[PDB]
Amino acid sequence: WXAXCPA
Amino acid sequence: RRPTRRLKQMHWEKLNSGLEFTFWTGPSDEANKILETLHTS
Amino acid sequence: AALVVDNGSGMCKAGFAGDDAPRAVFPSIVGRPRHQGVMVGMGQKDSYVGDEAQSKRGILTLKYPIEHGIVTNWDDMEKIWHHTFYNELRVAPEEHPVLLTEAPLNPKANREKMTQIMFETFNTPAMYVAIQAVLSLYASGRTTGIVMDSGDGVTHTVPIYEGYALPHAILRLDLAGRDLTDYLMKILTERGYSFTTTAEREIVRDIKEKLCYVALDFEQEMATAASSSSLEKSYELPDGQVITIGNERFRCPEALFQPSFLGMESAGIHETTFNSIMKCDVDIRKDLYANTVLSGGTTMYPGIADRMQKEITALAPSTMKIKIIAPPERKYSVWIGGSILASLSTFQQMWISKQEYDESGPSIVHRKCF
Amino acid sequence: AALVVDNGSGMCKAGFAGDDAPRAVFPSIVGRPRHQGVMVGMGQKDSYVGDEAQSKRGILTLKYPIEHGIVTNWDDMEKIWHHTFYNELRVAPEEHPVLLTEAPLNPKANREKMTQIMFETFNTPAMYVAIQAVLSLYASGRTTGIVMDSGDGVTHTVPIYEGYALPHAILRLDLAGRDLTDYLMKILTERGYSFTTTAEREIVRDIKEKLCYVALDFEQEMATAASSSSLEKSYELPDGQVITIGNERFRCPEALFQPSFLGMESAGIHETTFNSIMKCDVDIRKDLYANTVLSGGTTMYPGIADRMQKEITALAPSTMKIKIIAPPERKYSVWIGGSILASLSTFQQMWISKQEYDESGPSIVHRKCF
Amino acid sequence: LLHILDITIRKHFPQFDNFSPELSTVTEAAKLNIEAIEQECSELIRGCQNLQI
Numbered sequence A: 001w002x003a004x005c006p007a
Numbered sequence B: 001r002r003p004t005r006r007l008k009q010m011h012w013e014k015l016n017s018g019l020e021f022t023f024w025t026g027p028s029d030e031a032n033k034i035l036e037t038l039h040t041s
Numbered sequence C, D: 001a002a003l004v005v006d007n008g009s010g011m012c013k014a015g016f017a018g019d020d021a022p023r024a025v026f027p028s029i030v031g032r033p034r035h036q037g038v039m040v041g042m043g044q045k046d047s048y049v050g051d052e053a054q055s056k057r058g059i060l061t062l063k064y065p066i067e068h069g070i071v072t073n074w075d076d077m078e079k080i081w082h083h084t085f086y087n088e089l090r091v092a093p094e095e096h097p098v099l100l101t102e103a104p105l106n107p108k109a110n111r112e113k114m115t116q117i118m119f120e121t122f123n124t125p126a127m128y129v130a131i132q133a134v135l136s137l138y139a140s141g142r143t144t145g146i147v148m149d150s151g152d153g154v155t156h157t158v159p160i161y162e163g164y165a166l167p168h169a170i171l172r173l174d175l176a177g178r179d180l181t182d183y184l185m186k187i188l189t190e191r192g193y194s195f196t197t198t199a200e201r202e203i204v205r206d207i208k209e210k211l212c213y214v215a216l217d218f219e220q221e222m223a224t225a226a227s228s229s230s231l232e233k234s235y236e237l238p239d240g241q242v243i244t245i246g247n248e249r250f251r252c253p254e255a256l257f258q259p260s261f262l263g264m265e266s267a268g269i270h271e272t273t274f275n276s277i278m279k280c281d282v283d284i285r286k287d288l289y290a291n292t293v294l295s296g297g298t299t300m301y302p303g304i305a306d307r308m309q310k311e312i313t314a315l316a317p318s319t320m321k322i323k324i325i326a327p328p329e330r331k332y333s334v335w336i337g338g339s340i341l342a343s344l345s346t347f348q349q350m351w352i353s354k355q356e357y358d359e360s361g362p363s364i365v366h367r368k369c370f
Numbered sequence E: 001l002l003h004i005l006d007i008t009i010r011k012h013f014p015q016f017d018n019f020s021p022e023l024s025t026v027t028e029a030a031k032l033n034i035e036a037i038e039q040e041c042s043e044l045i046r047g048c049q050n051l052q053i
Ligand SMILES: Nc1ncnc2c1ncn2[C@@H]1O[C@H](COP(=O)(O)OP(=O)(O)O)[C@@H](O)[C@H]1O
Pocket: C007, C008, C009, C010, C011, C012, C150, C151, C152, C153, C177, C178, C181, C205, C208, C209, C210, C296, C297, C298, C300, C301, C331, C334
C-alpha cells in the first residue's frame, strides 16, 4: 500500500 | 387537415371562464405560423 | 460543589458545578498490553485508562467499555470512574455529591447498576441521574424543543417538552461517529491507505475531525472534486507520511443523511428528526420546529447546519418555519447543561441521599429521580 | 472463446472459457541473476518468468510482482502476462477477449492500470474484471452463501446473497498463505534450521504444503506433542539432509485462528466469518450460515473444515445450523467460476469494447465492472 | 406524447428549444405558498393596528 503495510 | 385513421385521444379541461379574457382569443400572427409550419413539417 | 461526571462512549467530561468548562476531558478507553514486558523494575501497570492509554496506544489493545450506548463491561466502567475522581480531578467523592447522565431509552438494569456501583464502591453522599438529551437543551437556555443528540454511541432525537422527555416520541438511530470512522477507513482503502488495527482507528478519527465536512449539494460536489484538485487536502501521519484525500472529505459525513451507503434501511438524521416531530401532538408542533438544537461531537461538521436546514425544509410543510440552533459549545452541551442543573438552589430537593438509599434499596432510583 | 486469466499473489492460472481445468498453472515469480555471466555458449536471458525461474531458483533473486493482491511492480507484471499469452497459452490476445480477477477492497489504481495495459499493450478486443470471491461461489453451483477465500495475500469473506455480492459486509484481512510461510521459517529456527533467502523461501512453502495440518484442539494437541514421537515427520531437502518437525506441524496453521502469534490485532479466520454474517440482514443470516463455502489454497489444510465448523458453532447461536462446504477442487475454484461466467450467453453484453474504453479512458473500469 | 414534442421542437422550432433557462423565477416561486405568505403579511397589519389603539 501507500500508508500502512508494505504493498 | 384530419388524420385518415383514429388516433390516441388526449383529454383537456375546458375553460369555465370566458375565452375572451384568456390569451386564446387573441389572433396573433405567431399562432398562424404554427399551423402553417405544422401542416408542412 | 457537586461533581458533574458525564460518561460517554467516546469521551467523558468531568468537572464542578458552576464552571463553564469541564476540568478533565479524556478519551473513555481501557487498554491492556498485548506484548510481554522485558524491562524489569519499571513498575508497569496492568491497565491504562484515559490519556495514558492514548499516549501508549501503539502497544495496547484499546477497548471501549461502552458500545452502542450499553455498557458491555461493568468492570472497566468502574476503572474509568476511579480514574476520573482520584487522578484527573484529584477530589475524593466522600464529601462531594456526584451527578451522572443516562442515555435515552436506557434499560432499567443499567439505571440500578450505576446507583449500586457508586453508592458502595465510592459511597458518595448524594446522587442524581438525568438524561443526556434533556441536559442538551438546558445549556442552550431553552426548556422546550427537539434535540438531535448525536455522538460516538447512537444518535437520539428526543423532543423534550417543559423539561420532560417524551417517552413515545424518542426515535433511535445507530448512525454515530464510530460508524463514520469505520466507514471512512473502508473508503480510504480506495486510495491505497490501509488502517485496520484499533491503534490506527484513533488516527482515522483525527482525520475525520480535521478535514471532513458536509457538502451542501452532493451531486454538484462530486463532479467538482473529480474535475479539479482544489478540494484535495494533505494530512501528516504520526510516522511522517503525508496522505491526500480528494473526495472522501464530503463522502464520509454524507453517510449521516444517506444511510444506504452503509447498507442501513433506516432513514437519515434529516428524516428521523422530521419523523420524531410528527409523533408529537399537533398543537405543540409549532414550538418544536423553531426550537431544534443540535448536540454532541458528531454534529460539529462544517456546513451541517445549512445542509440540515435545507433538507428538512423540503420535508416540512411550507407553512412551518425552520430554525436550526447550533451553538458553538455544542460539544460540551451535555456537560454544561448538567452544571446548570446542579447549581440550582431547588436541585437539593431531588437528591438521592445515602440514608434514604439504604432503607429503600437500589430500586429507589426508578421512582425518586425517574 | 475467451481467455480467463486469474492472476494471483502466489500462482496465476490461465486457460479457455468452457474448459474444466486451467491450461497453464505456473508460479507468479520474476527472477534476475545476481551473479555475473561467465560463459557465452547459452543465451543467459535477462530475466526468467514462471516455472523457468523455479528450476533455476538457486542463482536468482525471486521477486513477487503481487503483494497482498496489489501489483507493486507493473514492469514485472507485463512480463508475466506476455509470458502467459505467448509461451503458455500460445494464442494471440488481439483476437480473444480476456477476463481478469481482482480482490475486493483494492486500490482503484490497481484495476485502472489493468485496463490501460490490456487495451494498449496487448490490444485485446474486450476485457472484464470480476471479484475473486464471487467467482468461487459459482464453481460450487450456488448463488446464496458466504465465501471464505484465502490465498497468498488476501483472506476476504464476501457474503453473496444473490448474483451480486453485498458490498457493505465484505471483510478483508492481510493474513494468508504467504504470512504463514514467514511464520513457519521463524519458528523453524527453534529446531536449528535457518531459511533466509528467497530461494530458501520456496523450500519452506513445500514443507507447509505437505506436512502442516490444522489441529481440532490446539491445547490438547500441544500436550500430546510434549510426550514426543507419534507426531514428528521427516522431510528431505533438495540438498539431501533430512529434517524433522514436531509441534511446528500444527503451530503454523494455528496462526490463522489466533493471529496474535503474528502480532496482528485482527481477529481470526473463524471470528471474521461470524462478524461478516452479523453485518447482513436478519432474514438472510439463516441462508448464509448453512451455505458457507471455502476456497483458495490456504484452506486446503487437512482438517481446517472440521476445525472451522467447531469454532463457528460456539460463536453462532445454537438454533442455527452450520454446514461448511469444502469442494475437492477448491484450489481452482476461482478459475472454474470464471469459466462458467465467460461461457454464459448473457455475459456477452457485459464486455468492455475497445471503442468504449477509448471514449472514457481507463476510468470506465470502475463504472462498468464490479 | 411529450418525447415527440422534444424532437419536434428541436428539429423545426429552434426558438422553443429551451425555455427553462429563459424563465427561472417561476420555478423559485413554486416553492412558496401564496396563501400562507398572504396570511403571514396580513397578520403583521392586524397586530400593529391593535398596537395603535
Ligand atoms: N470537530 C469535530 N468534527 C467532527 N467530528 C467530531 C469532532 N469532534 C468530535 N467528533 C466526533 O464525535 C465523537 C465524540 O462524541 P461525544 O459527543 O464525546 O460522545 P458523547 O455524546 O457520548 O459524549 C468522536 O468520536 C469524534 O469522532
